[PDB]
Design a protein around this nucleic acid. Structure first.
Ligand SMILES: Nc1nc2c(ncn2[C@H]2C[C@H](O)[C@@H](COP(=O)(O)OP(=O)(O)OP(=O)(O)O)O2)c(=O)[nH]1
Ligand SMILES: Nc1nc2c(ncn2[C@H]2C[C@H](O)[C@@H](COP(=O)(O)OP(=O)(O)OP(=O)(O)O)O2)c(=O)[nH]1
Ligand SMILES: [Mn+2]
Ligand SMILES: [Mn+2]
Lengths: 178, 174
DNA sequence: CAGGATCCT
DNA sequence: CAGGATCCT
């Protein structure tokens, strides 16, 4: 909200800096968050020229760690403060090159990954259309899975691309989703 | 600000004839559709606020009742306001007090009254007991496997006894 | 469309 | 225990 606007390139340099610097405390132990479990989402992934904030999705190996990842987040040698922080969303105000920016951290479990990536990539208008179409065929789609009568629909997929095509829609790269 | 029980009762009495909503038309809220709930109904000597449940004749009016609430002969402001809860800061005498307005549909009335009467500790026990027999109780109804359990009850007393619990007057619930 | 964190009810 | 309003995501 109050955070400064970033250029796409500014955002990419922040993500790159953070890729090696995130960690969390787990019952005392300090566990590094692997760069490969950090997916850049939001307008940055859609490669928009200006961004209101930086959105990172964190992929967590086991459900037991959800309690601990965002609520005990750490960033090596970066000045920041917490706006709000639960298990699924944490909003930080970070200091970067003498400016204050909003950094949004989200968590997905490994089995949720492609649904999460699809959700947090957006844009909002695109997701409303996609979900409404699935709603007319009696499905509910969210960031956790595809559902039918409050029951998980177990799709045999791994990637976002595979998800979208399994949902019965045309795949477009993030940049071309409107 | 904190109220005595009697202060609270005089506020409710004043408001009983003064609530209305728009909606183009201005519709009076009947005193008989206004139930005092919360610690006032439990007759606690001191209260943190005044809680009133408003009973709505039809579901189509939910959109309009609290979101277009009006009070004749009173100065106030809205804190927050949705279809189910509206919180007002009212001027009474020479003081500011919190007034909480809740809505229940007619078919929900006894569930709402039971919920908003409390106290919280009592409701947690009651609901946990029903949870062990696979029911869910809330302010809207009694449910089983995401299906409304159609008890044909009218009053709160009838509800509690139908739920299989001992009826106690609000003052003695704990 | 769908859901999350906060601070309540 | 179970859920609501606000302002986000
Ligand atoms: N389903 C759904 N998802 C949303 C909604 N708002 C945001 N999201 C998801 C998709 C977004 O790409 C992601 C990040 O939200 P942001 O508000 O940061 O928007 P985005 O990053 O797209 O642009 P911006 O930060 O404004 O440059 O969260 C919503 O109303 N519904
Ligand atoms: N199920 C449930 N009901 C609640 C909860 N908190 C409040 N309520 C309901 C029952 C309460 O009697 C009613 C009014 O809440 P209040 O916070 O105003 O407490 P109460 O009025 O009993 O005392 P006070 O207002 O503090 O004098 O709302 C809760 O956590 N769970
Ligand atoms: Mn963003
Ligand atoms: Mn109260």
């Amino acid at each position: 909200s109050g955070g400064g606007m970033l250029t796409l390139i500014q955002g990419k340099k922040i993500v790159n800096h953070l890729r090696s610097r995130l960690a969390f405390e787990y019952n005392g132990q300090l566990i590094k968050i692997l760069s490969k479990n950090i997916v850049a989402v939001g307008s940055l992934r859609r490669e928009e020229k200006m961004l209101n904030d930086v959105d990172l999705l964190i992929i967590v190996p086991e459900k037991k760690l959800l309690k601990h990842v965002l609520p005990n987040i750490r960033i090596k040698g970066l000045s920041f403060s917490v706006k709000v922080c639960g298990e699924r969303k944490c909003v930080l105000f970070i200091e970067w090159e003498k400016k204050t920016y909003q950094l949004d951290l989200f968590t997905a479990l490994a089995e949720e990954k492609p649904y999460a990536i699809f959700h947090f990539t957006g844009p909002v208008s695109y997701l409303i259309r996609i979900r409404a179409a699935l709603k007319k065929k009696n499905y509910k789609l969210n960031q956790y899975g595809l559902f039918k009568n409050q029951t998980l629909v177990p799709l045999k997929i791994t990637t976002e691309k595979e998800l979208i095509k399994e949902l019965g829609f045309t795949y477009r790269i993030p940049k071309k989703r409107l």
